[PDB]
Design a protein around this ligand. Sequence first.
Ligand SMILES: [Mg+2]
Ligand SMILES: [Mg+2]
Ligand SMILES: [Mg+2]
Ligand SMILES: [Mg+2]
Ligand SMILES: [Mg+2]
Ligand SMILES: [Mg+2]
Ligand SMILES: [Mg+2]
Ligand SMILES: [Mg+2]
Ligand SMILES: [Mg+2]
Ligand SMILES: [Mg+2]
Ligand SMILES: [Mg+2]
Ligand SMILES: [Mg+2]
Ligand SMILES: [Mg+2]
Ligand SMILES: [Mg+2]
Ligand SMILES: [Mg+2]
Ligand SMILES: [Mg+2]
Ligand SMILES: [Mg+2]
Ligand SMILES: [Mg+2]
Ligand SMILES: [Mg+2]
Ligand SMILES: [Mg+2]
Ligand SMILES: [Mg+2]
Ligand SMILES: [Mg+2]
Ligand SMILES: [Mg+2]
Ligand SMILES: [Mg+2]
Ligand SMILES: [Mg+2]
Ligand SMILES: [Mg+2]
Ligand SMILES: [Mg+2]
Ligand SMILES: [Mg+2]
Ligand SMILES: [Mg+2]
Ligand SMILES: [Mg+2]
Ligand SMILES: [Mg+2]
Ligand SMILES: [Mg+2]
Ligand SMILES: [Mg+2]
Ligand SMILES: [Mg+2]
Ligand SMILES: [Mg+2]
Ligand SMILES: [Mg+2]
Ligand SMILES: [Mg+2]
Ligand SMILES: [Mg+2]
Ligand SMILES: [Mg+2]
Ligand SMILES: [Mg+2]
Ligand SMILES: [Mg+2]
Ligand SMILES: [Mg+2]
Ligand SMILES: [Mg+2]
Ligand SMILES: [Mg+2]
Ligand SMILES: [Mg+2]
Ligand SMILES: [Mg+2]
Ligand SMILES: [Mg+2]
Ligand SMILES: [Mg+2]
Ligand SMILES: [Mg+2]
Ligand SMILES: [Mg+2]
Ligand SMILES: [Mg+2]
Ligand SMILES: [Mg+2]
Ligand SMILES: [Mg+2]
Ligand SMILES: [Mg+2]
Ligand SMILES: [Mg+2]
Ligand SMILES: [Mg+2]
Ligand SMILES: [Mg+2]
Ligand SMILES: [Mg+2]
Ligand SMILES: [Mg+2]
Ligand SMILES: [Mg+2]
Ligand SMILES: [Mg+2]
Ligand SMILES: [Mg+2]
Ligand SMILES: [Mg+2]
Ligand SMILES: [Mg+2]
Ligand SMILES: [Mg+2]
Ligand SMILES: [Mg+2]
Ligand SMILES: [Mg+2]
Ligand SMILES: [Mg+2]
Ligand SMILES: [Mg+2]
Ligand SMILES: [Mg+2]
Ligand SMILES: [Mg+2]
Ligand SMILES: [Mg+2]
Ligand SMILES: [Mg+2]
Ligand SMILES: [Mg+2]
Ligand SMILES: [Mg+2]
Ligand SMILES: [Mg+2]
Ligand SMILES: [Mg+2]
Ligand SMILES: [Mg+2]
Ligand SMILES: [Mg+2]
Ligand SMILES: [Mg+2]
Ligand SMILES: [Mg+2]
Ligand SMILES: [Mg+2]
Ligand SMILES: [Mg+2]
Ligand SMILES: [Mg+2]
Ligand SMILES: [Mg+2]
Ligand SMILES: [Mg+2]
Ligand SMILES: [Mg+2]
Ligand SMILES: [Mg+2]
Ligand SMILES: [Mg+2]
Ligand SMILES: [Mg+2]
Ligand SMILES: [Mg+2]
Ligand SMILES: [Mg+2]
Ligand SMILES: [Mg+2]
Ligand SMILES: [Mg+2]
Ligand SMILES: [Mg+2]
Ligand SMILES: [Mg+2]
Ligand SMILES: [Mg+2]
Ligand SMILES: [Mg+2]
Ligand SMILES: [Mg+2]
Ligand SMILES: [Mg+2]
Ligand SMILES: [Mg+2]
Ligand SMILES: [Mg+2]
Ligand SMILES: [Mg+2]
Ligand SMILES: [Mg+2]
Ligand SMILES: [Mg+2]
Ligand SMILES: [Mg+2]
Ligand SMILES: [Mg+2]
Lengths: 147, 210
Amino acid sequence: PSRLRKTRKLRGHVSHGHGRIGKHRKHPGGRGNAGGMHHHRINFDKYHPGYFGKVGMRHYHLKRNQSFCPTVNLDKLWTLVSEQTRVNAAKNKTGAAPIIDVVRSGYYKVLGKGKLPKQPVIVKAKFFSRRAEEKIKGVGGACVLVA
Amino acid sequence: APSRNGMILKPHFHKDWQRRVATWFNQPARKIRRRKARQARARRIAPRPAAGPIRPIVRCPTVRYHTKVRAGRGFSLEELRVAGIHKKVARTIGISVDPRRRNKSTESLQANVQRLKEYRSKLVLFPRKPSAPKKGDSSAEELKLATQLTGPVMPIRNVFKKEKARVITEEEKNFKAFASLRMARANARLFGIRAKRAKEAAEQDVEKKK
RNA sequence: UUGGAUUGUUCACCCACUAAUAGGGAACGUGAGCUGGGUUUAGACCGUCGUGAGACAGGUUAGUUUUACCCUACUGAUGAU
RNA sequence: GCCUCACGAUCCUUCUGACCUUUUGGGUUUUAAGCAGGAGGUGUCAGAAAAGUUACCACAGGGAUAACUGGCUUGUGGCGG
RNA sequence: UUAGUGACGCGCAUGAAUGGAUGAACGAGAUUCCCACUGUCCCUACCUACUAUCCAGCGAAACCACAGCCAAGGGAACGGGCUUGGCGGAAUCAGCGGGGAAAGAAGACCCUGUUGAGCUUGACUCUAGUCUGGCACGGUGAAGAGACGUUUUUUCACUGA
RNA sequence: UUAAUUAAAACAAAGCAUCGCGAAGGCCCGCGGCGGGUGUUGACGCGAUGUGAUUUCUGCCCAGUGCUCUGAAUGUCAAA
RNA sequence: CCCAUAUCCGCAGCAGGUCUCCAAGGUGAACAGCCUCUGGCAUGUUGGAACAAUGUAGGUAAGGGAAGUCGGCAAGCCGG
RNA sequence: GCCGUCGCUGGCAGUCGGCAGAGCGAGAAAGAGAGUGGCGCGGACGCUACGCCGCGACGAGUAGGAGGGCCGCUGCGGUGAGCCUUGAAGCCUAGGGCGCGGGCCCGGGUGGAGCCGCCGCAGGUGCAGAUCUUGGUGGUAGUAGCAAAUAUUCAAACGAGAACUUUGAAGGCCGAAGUGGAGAAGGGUUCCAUGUGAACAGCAGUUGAACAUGGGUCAGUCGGUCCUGAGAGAUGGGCGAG
RNA sequence: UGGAAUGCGAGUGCCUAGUGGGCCACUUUUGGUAAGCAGAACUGGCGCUGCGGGAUGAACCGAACGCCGGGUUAAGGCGCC
RNA sequence: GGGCCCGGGGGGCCACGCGUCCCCCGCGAGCGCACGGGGUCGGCGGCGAUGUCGGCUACCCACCCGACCCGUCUUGAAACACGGACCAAGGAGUCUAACACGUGCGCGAGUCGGGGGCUACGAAAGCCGCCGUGGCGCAAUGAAGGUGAAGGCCGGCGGCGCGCCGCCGGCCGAGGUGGGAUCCCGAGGCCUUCCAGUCCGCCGAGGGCGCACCACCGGCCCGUCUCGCCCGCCGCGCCGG
RNA sequence: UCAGUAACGGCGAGUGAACAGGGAAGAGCCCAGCGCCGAAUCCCCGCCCCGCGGCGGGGCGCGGGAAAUGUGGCGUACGGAAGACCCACUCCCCGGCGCCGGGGGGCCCAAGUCCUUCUGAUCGAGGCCCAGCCCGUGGACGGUGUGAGGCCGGUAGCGGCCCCCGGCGCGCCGGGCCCGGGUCUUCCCGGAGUCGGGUUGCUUGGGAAUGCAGCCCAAAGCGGGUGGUAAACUCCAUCUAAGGCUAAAUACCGGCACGAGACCGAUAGUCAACAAGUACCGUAAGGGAAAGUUGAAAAGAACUUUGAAGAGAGAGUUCAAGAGGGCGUGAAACCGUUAAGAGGUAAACGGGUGGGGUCCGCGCAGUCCGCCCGGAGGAUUCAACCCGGCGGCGCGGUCCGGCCGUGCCGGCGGGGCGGAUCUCCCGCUCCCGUCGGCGGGGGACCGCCCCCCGGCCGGCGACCGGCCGCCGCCGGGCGCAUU
Ligand SMILES: [Mg+2]
Ligand SMILES: [Mg+2]
Ligand SMILES: [Mg+2]
Ligand SMILES: [Mg+2]
Ligand SMILES: [Mg+2]
Ligand SMILES: [Mg+2]
Ligand SMILES: [Mg+2]
Ligand SMILES: [Mg+2]
Ligand SMILES: [Mg+2]
Ligand SMILES: [Mg+2]
Ligand SMILES: [Mg+2]
Ligand SMILES: [Mg+2]
Ligand SMILES: [Mg+2]
Ligand SMILES: [Mg+2]
Ligand SMILES: [Mg+2]
Ligand SMILES: [Mg+2]
Ligand SMILES: [Mg+2]
Ligand SMILES: [Mg+2]
Ligand SMILES: [Mg+2]
Ligand SMILES: [Mg+2]
Ligand SMILES: [Mg+2]
Ligand SMILES: [Mg+2]
Ligand SMILES: [Mg+2]
Ligand SMILES: [Mg+2]
Ligand SMILES: [Mg+2]
Ligand SMILES: [Mg+2]
Ligand SMILES: [Mg+2]
Ligand SMILES: [Mg+2]
Ligand SMILES: [Mg+2]
Ligand SMILES: [Mg+2]
Ligand SMILES: [Mg+2]
Ligand SMILES: [Mg+2]
Ligand SMILES: [Mg+2]
Ligand SMILES: [Mg+2]
Ligand SMILES: [Mg+2]
Ligand SMILES: [Mg+2]
Ligand SMILES: [Mg+2]
Ligand SMILES: [Mg+2]
Ligand SMILES: [Mg+2]
Ligand SMILES: [Mg+2]
Ligand SMILES: [Mg+2]
Ligand SMILES: [Mg+2]
Ligand SMILES: [Mg+2]
Ligand SMILES: [Mg+2]
Ligand SMILES: [Mg+2]
Ligand SMILES: [Mg+2]
Ligand SMILES: [Mg+2]
Ligand SMILES: [Mg+2]
Ligand SMILES: [Mg+2]
Ligand SMILES: [Mg+2]
Ligand SMILES: [Mg+2]
Ligand SMILES: [Mg+2]
Ligand SMILES: [Mg+2]
Ligand SMILES: [Mg+2]
Ligand SMILES: [Mg+2]
Ligand SMILES: [Mg+2]
Ligand SMILES: [Mg+2]
Ligand SMILES: [Mg+2]
Ligand SMILES: [Mg+2]
Ligand SMILES: [Mg+2]
Ligand SMILES: [Mg+2]
Ligand SMILES: [Mg+2]
Ligand SMILES: [Mg+2]
Ligand SMILES: [Mg+2]
Ligand SMILES: [Mg+2]
Ligand SMILES: [Mg+2]
Ligand SMILES: [Mg+2]
Ligand SMILES: [Mg+2]
Ligand SMILES: [Mg+2]
Ligand SMILES: [Mg+2]
Ligand SMILES: [Mg+2]
Ligand SMILES: [Mg+2]
Ligand SMILES: [Mg+2]
Ligand SMILES: [Mg+2]
Ligand SMILES: [Mg+2]
Ligand SMILES: [Mg+2]
Ligand SMILES: [Mg+2]
Ligand SMILES: [Mg+2]
Ligand SMILES: [Mg+2]
Ligand SMILES: [Mg+2]
Ligand SMILES: [Mg+2]
Ligand SMILES: [Mg+2]
Ligand SMILES: [Mg+2]
Ligand SMILES: [Mg+2]
Ligand SMILES: [Mg+2]
Ligand SMILES: [Mg+2]
Ligand SMILES: [Mg+2]
Ligand SMILES: [Mg+2]
Ligand SMILES: [Mg+2]
Ligand SMILES: [Mg+2]
Ligand SMILES: [Mg+2]
Ligand SMILES: [Mg+2]
Ligand SMILES: [Mg+2]
Ligand SMILES: [Mg+2]
Ligand SMILES: [Mg+2]
Ligand SMILES: [Mg+2]
Ligand SMILES: [Mg+2]
Ligand SMILES: [Mg+2]
Ligand SMILES: [Mg+2]
Ligand SMILES: [Mg+2]
Ligand SMILES: [Mg+2]
Ligand SMILES: [Mg+2]
Ligand SMILES: [Mg+2]
Ligand SMILES: [Mg+2]
Ligand SMILES: [Mg+2]
Ligand SMILES: [Mg+2]
Ligand SMILES: [Mg+2]
């Protein structure tokens, strides 16, 4: 609201907070990003390294659906199934492992950050990282590849 | 002028954007107008379903969405042919037809054929002349109970096949998913070049032979 | 502490008279005091310069000079204590 | 090179390098684009691509800045020990 | 006699249709001198008309921070105001042009502006027009020279575009 | 002749001298065409310049910059 | 009907501008200037009283005669 | 002495009452500890804790920043069993006051119909300037001025009123290239009669081209009308996105 | 025996306006005849700042400022103003 | 002079019980005055209804001291710098978008229905949950193809020859160093007739767990470089690790 | 939403889509061609019946023309046609006629002008028995001499009545159609100076060229186009260009008719609240204002008198002209007059006093309060006890009854929600009547919650009743006076 802003406090103060010497003039320095390679060079180099120039290949007609690959780490793996799924498997004696289907939860690749609980599991997924596969195998699990 | 740290911004306000501002103050009015036309349309076509013709099941394209099924545009002529519904008769009884759509696989085809057979089983058909029933018209006892259906006809849902826990076999334990994945990429990558090298070697060896 | 010829001239020089023909300031006194000869708009000529448009502390000719009734000062004129 | 100088961004082009990556539905091959390192140059040398004239002139300003007076100074000029 | 005229000419920098030299007549063109004439002047005076003037009626405007006596001082280096002195007496009339660095117009001069415009060219980038070659409209027939019955080209004709 | 600061020595002028053109042409207009002006014209004409009555004369220079003329003899030279 | 020092255009009853026809006597070369008749007007958007300066517009000046001034500007001389 | 700011990131929930017992500021850690053996019916204020209280130091300010306004303006949600024809807003006031101030309260007058406090919300929200915009008013000032083109005077009339109107008489001027008599263009009723004397006619007016009320333009022969002029301009055609 | 004196609570992070014409003096100091000239170092000023004194004065001397009473002073003064 | 002004043979002491052992030789009462944690009088007098009393400020006037006209640019303005004759009313940092940081609220590894739909004020509000599509966040890195976030100990075997590498089974397990608010223990200690010994509290040398945060050292992930020896197989590879 | 992204760009400044996904809406079709049907087709004129303000339906003409240089029917890429065999068929439309159930217009529908009272007039204030004037499905708003649910218009109402238009239904007459599905057999099948290519210019995010256009070249038929880096070879995928129609969801500062607003309030808001695109300016294109308010009601000031009149003095209307026709209020600047004060350093100004005014204290013998002493009086007379009511508290050391634990335990408890925890019934479907899969359902189990019952502890200070006790207060008695 306008009643809480500086203008109400700047009534009677001539310059309105812009100074008597420099004044508030229209566009000193240029408009927008003018001067980036010129009188504004220090700001751009100091705060925006890399801004000027070109790097890497072009790709025409990029379709971001083709590279769709949501990832999940192993430390969040057991959140995809219910809590009773884990405890029932942990306490059961037959040794049956539950199937966790990451694609059903909306993930494609499984990544290795984290530590799994000491509990066998069967993991279905399109992709696995190397370390994810070993951590899943270290607890007695198995990796299953889906398409 | 830039001032200390910040983001570099490029607002697209270098045209006469104020000459083409679209406000939305008529939004409540549109919602009432569209609602008032859904109701007036539902009354007009009653007891036919207000949602409209039944739509088939289709799988969304691309790898981001091919795990989902949704309502298509219309049943394919192959799906209607397998279900024994004439394509010109299909629309007259609330079935949507899409002559463009193809059937590449049988499962999707049979999924929509069962859909059409289930819908045909729920169809209550009023005789063209009320006093003179005909061969396929529903019996009077089930015409009394006919009531307009709200919401999409036989809504389409994504149902997941629950797999129960099973003992892991030594063969699954020994499978190497990452090594398999990396070698599969490499074989696809080098398949063409490997055959070209193989073909030259055959020619290279043959020339010495003969 | 002057009258004059030449010069827009300041300056200069000469003629002549004279006691003498001293030197200066006052916003280089003084343009709502004048004049406008010179300089310093627009026209035009010559020379030198410039391919040119044009330029020249180089010549030449023609080229609008506004207002006071206010305050003060000053000059006079009524008057006031 | 005894030391303190002897030199040049982005974009673009050109060369060198890899059993390199990509060249878009797949494969081969030309081509093209990438990645790393040199060079082609900006001497106004942190790097626009650039001739005049205006007295026919214009606008925004400037006493930050020249053309009078005034002010400080007095080399020069003048005058005096 | 820094003027004029006539001569002189190593002419800063004269000169031949960027025309040179001349010359009658002509000129509201520039300049010098002479006669005549005169208030241009010595050196001013008087007279006439209309004003100004005073009155009755009627009646603006420019301009204005507040204002309105000076000397010096210091001060944004020339004060109406300030400091120190000189001093100061209502309300007004006719004149006057010293001052108000008076009014008039955001200085035309000069500079600056990454503000212009008219004009020029050996500036930069273009462009109408124009010259030139190719392709199409675009054909018929004889010869010559080529190339492997076809095909390119030169000349000469034809007519139907 | 610069209406409203310049009436002039400036402009014009007759005279003089160059230059282009014989019509599918010269010079010019026009976005456009079987368009238009000169032209109801035809070289004693039309178009483009310079000088500026008469008198007398108008010298030398084609290196420069222009303009112009010759070209398969012939370097460079686009598309096709 | 006005047709222009008041009917038009210049902001106005503005000394500006705005196309025509008729055209007496005298003097005189004369449609010059000066006076008059026919016709017209009331002094130009006011009057009264004074007769200072300074003006604007007219004049006249002894003796000299451009000594004035940038310059004979202005006035004057001449005049049929 | 008083005001505010800052600091002590100071103190106060202990108003623990007759179900009582009043203290914890004092140089120097930690209990006004608990136990086991050897008559009256009484006692101020406080504490919106966003409150209240104490102690010490400090206080210049352009540009600029920040805080607090129980400063002010308009409208919206709530609230004030708000105010008001027994008088709202507005305005005026040598009336009484409050606040450092921005401002506000009350008294008196005028006025004639609406208005305000508080908690929140919102903003086209606060003027001395901008050669600011629009409107109004000053001094100048009863001043400049009402001076181009020779000129008026006498008598009478109407009338409230006469330098200016009308009539008569004088003296003058334009002096047939006119201040005369008629037209074109332009005007558009200004023409004519009667009336008025508000406004206008830069004095006045008994007057006017002003105002008001009514009238006035008559054609075979005078023009237009017709012709063609320089020129303009359709069709056919051409061009052209149109 | 926190290992010299003295004084004082410190560290750290975000966001940030105005400014980017200065000028003056002691001392040092460049150019210049010099300049109230131009150009540097150090510190302090004026700019932004009143107040007592230097009659007057941006910068000198004293001293820095909430609204007051009493006392005393600084630099400067005490013929009269 | 110094030694509670050492020891022996008229004037002031913030000496003044005693049993002693012996160096040496824990509460008296009252009363009162005050140079005592900032002023009181338990002291008085005159005047007052028609001309007098009080009234800061305000209206007018006088006097003494002070005192240049504001706004503005400016090193410097009272300036002979510009705007301003006077009065009223109007009159200039806004709204949209994006971003950053700070603050407040909600929920929280999630969060957000904004588009859509359902059911006078109300164009509001309520709801959706198989409307969460989707945005942002939860993963980075590389131009890209792509890859994509701790280890150790015990036992056994194979190879090299007690140490190293590879493959097998069991146990522990998200690093450490310095600082670090707070918390924890507690050597000893917090009195009343005197001793013993308790319950609750309370203080505290020293010693511990150490938040956030900082510095430092390790580790892990992706690009790239150097060195180098192995391991896998439906593809024995210019394969993959 | 993708997305300020892929991309474009002196790769600077800047620019910048699409696909997928979720929604709004949803609708599909027709020719040429290739063929078959005796042109089976169409227009117009004349006569008869019907209708006739949307010019049409039927019948009859050796009536006219169009059209084989191609009309109509079938049929169009989803394939289509003809034939054969099986199977199935009577409603679908056109032009007339009659009968039965949203829109526009008109008229109407509750309750105070009750009693006092203020006012110029009021709609104001006060009141209207228990109970609470009356109506209320109407307390929106406007009007009326303030300020009004009830005075009037209205407002409310699945209220009423009366006209007209429409929509939806049901019958009769005269016409048209003589209509389909499947399996086999045989046949047929497509748009050219267009595509495509070169080049030029423009355009796009489209980059060895996204779209468009000019000129040149100029097609094919298992072809052609697209497949986001030029090109050759090769597989694939996907469409079928150069003919055509099509509602809806979308847009809307003009127009007609309406509703609303945290908007402005006569220098604002449109330029325009009013005889405003007016007056006025310009030759013209154009430019373009100012300007709202008496009063409740004109009751708008008769009449007398001075003056030529304008103007005045009286008089009168009105609540008020101290509202007098550009009249509500009526500011400042500026001006007149009256009163007071003052006046030779322009005026004004800060500080300090002093003098004089105007008014204020609605001043002028000077405060109020508690307790106590004394003198005069007077009483709805004090304490203490008794009856009743209410309240507070109670560790009632541990009284009864309640609700109740965002408490803990025991249950053959009677249930809802959820679960990526397990598992007898059925629908479709492959295979032989068998037997396996998808989908729809019990049931069990786990977690949480609600309700029932028993045992401990436990609150009632956001959550209480009865008795008992103590205390306080109130009403009534008695106390009758050293209180
Ligand atoms: Mg400030
Ligand atoms: Mg600021
Ligand atoms: Mg400013
Ligand atoms: Mg600046
Ligand atoms: Mg600056
Ligand atoms: Mg800005
Ligand atoms: Mg900045
Ligand atoms: Mg001078
Ligand atoms: Mg002068
Ligand atoms: Mg002059
Ligand atoms: Mg001159
Ligand atoms: Mg000149
Ligand atoms: Mg030359
Ligand atoms: Mg060497
Ligand atoms: Mg660049
Ligand atoms: Mg391909
Ligand atoms: Mg010139
Ligand atoms: Mg010049
Ligand atoms: Mg000078
Ligand atoms: Mg000397
Ligand atoms: Mg001479
Ligand atoms: Mg000579
Ligand atoms: Mg020659
Ligand atoms: Mg020459
Ligand atoms: Mg007079
Ligand atoms: Mg002055
Ligand atoms: Mg003074
Ligand atoms: Mg003067
Ligand atoms: Mg001047
Ligand atoms: Mg200027
Ligand atoms: Mg100028
Ligand atoms: Mg610059
Ligand atoms: Mg230019
Ligand atoms: Mg131009
Ligand atoms: Mg060139
Ligand atoms: Mg002229
Ligand atoms: Mg002239
Ligand atoms: Mg020539
Ligand atoms: Mg030559
Ligand atoms: Mg006269
Ligand atoms: Mg007269
Ligand atoms: Mg006249
Ligand atoms: Mg006159
Ligand atoms: Mg004489
Ligand atoms: Mg004589
Ligand atoms: Mg002379
Ligand atoms: Mg002389
Ligand atoms: Mg003369
Ligand atoms: Mg301060
Ligand atoms: Mg007053
Ligand atoms: Mg009223
Ligand atoms: Mg507003
Ligand atoms: Mg204002
Ligand atoms: Mg103002
Ligand atoms: Mg006068
Ligand atoms: Mg005439
Ligand atoms: Mg006449
Ligand atoms: Mg008059
Ligand atoms: Mg007349
Ligand atoms: Mg034409
Ligand atoms: Mg200096
Ligand atoms: Mg400054
Ligand atoms: Mg400072
Ligand atoms: Mg100071
Ligand atoms: Mg001095
Ligand atoms: Mg003192
Ligand atoms: Mg002194
Ligand atoms: Mg003084
Ligand atoms: Mg300024
Ligand atoms: Mg300056
Ligand atoms: Mg100033
Ligand atoms: Mg000065
Ligand atoms: Mg200026
Ligand atoms: Mg001014
Ligand atoms: Mg935040
Ligand atoms: Mg609404
Ligand atoms: Mg994004
Ligand atoms: Mg664009
Ligand atoms: Mg899409
Ligand atoms: Mg939908
Ligand atoms: Mg056909
Ligand atoms: Mg199709
Ligand atoms: Mg009613
Ligand atoms: Mg009532
Ligand atoms: Mg009402
Ligand atoms: Mg009403
Ligand atoms: Mg009522
Ligand atoms: Mg009613
Ligand atoms: Mg109704
Ligand atoms: Mg087609
Ligand atoms: Mg273009
Ligand atoms: Mg473009
Ligand atoms: Mg490709
Ligand atoms: Mg269409
Ligand atoms: Mg108005
Ligand atoms: Mg308006
Ligand atoms: Mg107004
Ligand atoms: Mg207003
Ligand atoms: Mg107006
Ligand atoms: Mg008004
Ligand atoms: Mg009144
Ligand atoms: Mg009134
Ligand atoms: Mg009224
Ligand atoms: Mg009014
Ligand atoms: Mg009034
Ligand atoms: Mg007065
Ligand atoms: Mg007086």
